């Protein structure tokens, strides 16, 4: 019965893969989201304007007719990356942002200084990866040893702290300035590590940064519920074939594009914070990125839908996040 | 190449399953170990003397010719278990010990315990008659973080239980934390513990960095490195109330590598050489025999074995998998080169 009408959302953190997997997964995004930040961690990564242009067109080829969907491309920051290439792609409207995955930050200072100069946002997967650092500590450690020093050196740089998973990060972002923002996935709001590990190990909940203890989940839910306007929707939908997930060494990533929007609606509703839902989905991100809000509207209805058990691929299947479960809100 | 001769070891914590799986896995234990504590968590559990006798015989049936192996049976403690039944199985040599799994108010009375308070008559009887209690020491309340569940058990269940029943002999099975190592180190002659090879060799990073590794997923869950190092320090100390219990806990590959992977490591094939590796790395091989072959017998009041086996420090590859009637088992350290194996 209950219906919620919102400005059409965008997805500020998305993995669309390539080839046949791209063809399968794009429609789950393009049907709902006006735009998405398309991450560059292909094999090999998207590190040139030419590669981004070709990749954008492959994405466009896979968008069903009638979906007004625009992929916002990103550059995978590397050592060899020429700041001129990055800026050129930015000036041509090819690169919307650049993504920093965990030789060093100091090594790419010139590139980062060009981003600061030209007003290009930096998207950060904020974990330090030293073998001596416990996997649950990697996010907190990044803040202290990389994020804060970076932000102090490059005070005009716009940074999105992607897919935050900790109270540490929530507090850091809450207390930051207008040049710092964050995305939060549906899984990090809905679950904590217990959901992944109690009663069985659930690789479909295994993703990076890893699900944390419940106090961290709670800090994230409180952050979105507060109306803080520098957190916004980023699914980190990160699809892997079923048997790459269900294996002796399961890949990290939740395929949550089919279920994310309704899952977010549930969280905000549970937090008595639906008054802040639209801004999270459809306004905060555009504002931070300096892009217009979408001028179309969609409706969610509070009617239970069962999530498919699997989605066919050319070979193997894809298991969606929440496969077989019931979702409380669906897109009308 | 170095040789380590030891008195034949025993495994003070083992899952042998039943049916065809039992037939497959028994030999990995019987070839090496003189005795093993056979856990009772079959479907349905072993909660009666009659079931334990029949299960014992099925295990004996599956022992290859010439292996000198004796299964030591246990009773699964449940709300509905008659203390007279437990006592009678103990008096008749059927039950060597009883096993307490985590309490849960929603458990069927025939399959487990709702609260420890609710099985006091049975625990009192065990105390009375000198039967040891083997504890899987975790609290499983939904609001407790899985990594805290062992430590929470110590405070909430173990310490009060031992304070209530002062004569009760307890094994803290498969300890995984510094909390438990400290608690056991500081306890009295009536408290002991077992430790698995995986909890000595690995921490949670090994299960989660670079990919999720269901063959390292077991309960109690692997903990932080500080906990691993505490365990290693405990065994290497020579402390004599910690002993070998593999918790070898086999599941079909398809049940491990699934959307909801079962907990347990099939470590029977590789455990003994893995313990030798750990003790050697800790410069404590002089304590290795006692851990494997002496400390458990002394705690249980049973004789030490008077035959010997030899480990040899010659590199070997572990099988990638072991065939079952249907599907396959993936052993602990599958495909790896190990340092020590049984001659
Ligand atoms: N989140 C994940 O667990 N995986 C992502 C990468 C990432 O966002 O770090 C992927 O591309 O597979
Ligand atoms: O408590 C347990 C049970 C065991 C099993 O599978 O029997 N496996 C485990 O990992 N630990
Ligand atoms: Zn990331
Ligand atoms: Zn990502
Ligand atoms: Zn156990
Ligand atoms: Zn066990």
From Swiss-Prot, chain A:
One of its GO terms (cellular component) is cytoplasm. Binds 2 Zn(2+) ions per subunit. In vitro, can also use Co(2+) or Cd(2+). Coiled coil: none annotated. Pathway: Pyrimidine metabolism; UMP biosynthesis via de novo pathway; (S)-dihydroorotate from bicarbonate: step 3/3. Its EC number is 3.5.2.3. Induction: Induced by pyrimidine limitation. The keyword Hydrolase applies. It holds the Pfam family Amidohydro_1. Zn(2+) 1 binds at residues 13, 15, 99, 236. Zn(2+) 2 binds at residues 99, 125, 163. The modification N6-carboxylysine is found at residue 99. It comes from the Bacteria. Catalyzes the reversible cyclization of carbamoyl aspartate to dihydroorotate. There is an asymmetry between active sites in the dimer, with dihydroorotate bound to the active site of subunit A and N-carbamoyl-L-aspartate bound to the active site of subunit B. Homodimer. NCBIfam families: pyrC_dimer (TIGR00856). This is Dihydroorotase.
């Amino acid at each position: 019965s209950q219906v919620l009408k919102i400005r059409r959302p965008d997805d500020w953190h998305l993995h669309l893969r390539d080839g046949d997997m791209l063809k399968t997964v794009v429609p789950y995004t393009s049907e709902i989201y006006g735009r998405a930040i398309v991450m560059p961690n292909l094999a090999p990564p998207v590190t040139t304007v030419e590669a981004a242009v070709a990749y954008r067109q492959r994405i466009l080829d896979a968008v069903p007719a009638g979906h007004d969907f625009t992929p916002l491309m990103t550059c995978y920051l590397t050592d060899s990356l020429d700041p001129n290439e990055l800026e050129r792609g930015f000036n041509e409207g090819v690169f919307t942002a650049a993504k920093l995955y965990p030789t060093s930050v100091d090594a790419i200072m010139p590139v980062l200084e060009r981003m600061e100069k030209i007003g290009m946002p930096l998207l950060v997967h904020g974990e330090v990866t030293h073998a001596d650092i416990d996997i649950f500590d990697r996010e907190a450690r990044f803040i202290e040893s990389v994020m804060e020093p970076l932000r102090q050196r490059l005070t005009a740089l716009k940074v999105v702290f992607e897919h935050i998973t900790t109270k540490d990060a929530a507090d850091y972002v809450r207390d930051g300035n207008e040049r710092l923002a964050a995305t939060i996935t549906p899984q990090h709001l809905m679950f904590n590590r217990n959901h992944m590990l109690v009663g069985g190990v659930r690789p479909h909940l295994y993703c990076l940064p890893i699900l944390k203890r419940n106090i961290h989940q709670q800090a994230l839910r409180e952050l979105v519920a507060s109306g803080f306007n520098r957190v916004f929707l980023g699914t980190d939908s990160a699809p892997h074939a079923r048997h790459r997930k269900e294996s002796s060494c399961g890949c990290a990533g939740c395929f949550n594009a089919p279920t994310a929007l309704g899952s977010y609606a549930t969280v905000f509703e549970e937090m008595n914070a639906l008054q802040h839902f639209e801004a999270f989905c459809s306004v905060n991100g555009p504002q931070f990125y300096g892009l217009p809000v979408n001028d179309t509207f969609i409706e969610l209805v509070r009617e239970e839908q069962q999530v498919a058990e699997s989605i066919a691929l050319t070979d193997d299947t894809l298991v969606p996040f929440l496969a077989g479960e019931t979702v409380r809100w669906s897109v009308k």
